[PDB]
Homo-oligomer: A and B are copies of this chain.
């Protein structure tokens, strides 16, 4: 099934929203298949934000996330990428609707607690950069009968 990369940014971990964010994804009926905590290299981040290497404020971004703690995740399930983005909200937490992670907990775009994959093509690249194949664990979700067809 469709996989997406969801990463709790440093400010997410600092504010103690790790549990809350996971709970939100679990309750949706989604499948956690990989999770790790790491202080990301400025070189792992260089490749994750290759798409956004084309942004004016970049020299501030990479050093930032590299410092603070990060909880990297992969979640699996039908229309994973879009629904994760839906659960997260818009980029700007001010224009982001209530009910979303960013719309319930964030104020500024520089500190939006979470990253979600923008497209399925973006997701598959992001997963490979952040995780080893061995890391992605295969398990049968007992509940999938009552979430899916």
- Which residues of A in the span 106-149 have a Cβ within 8 Å of any Cβ on B? 106-108, 110-111, 135, 137-139, 141-143, 145-149
Count of interface residues, chain A, beta-carbon cutoff 8 Å: 64
Point out residues on A near B: beta carbons under 8 Å.
10-11, 13-30, 32-39, 68-69, 71, 77-79, 82-83, 86-87, 89, 94, 97-100, 103-108, 110-111, 135, 137-139, 141-143, 145-149
Chain B residues lying within 8 Å of A28, measured Cβ to Cβ, are 104-107
Say yes or no: A139 contacts B97, CB within 8 Å: no
Q: Would you call B111 and A146 a contact (CB within 8 A)?
A: yes
CB pair A148–B30 under 8 Å, yes or no, is: no
Complex contact A32–B15 (CB within 8 A): no
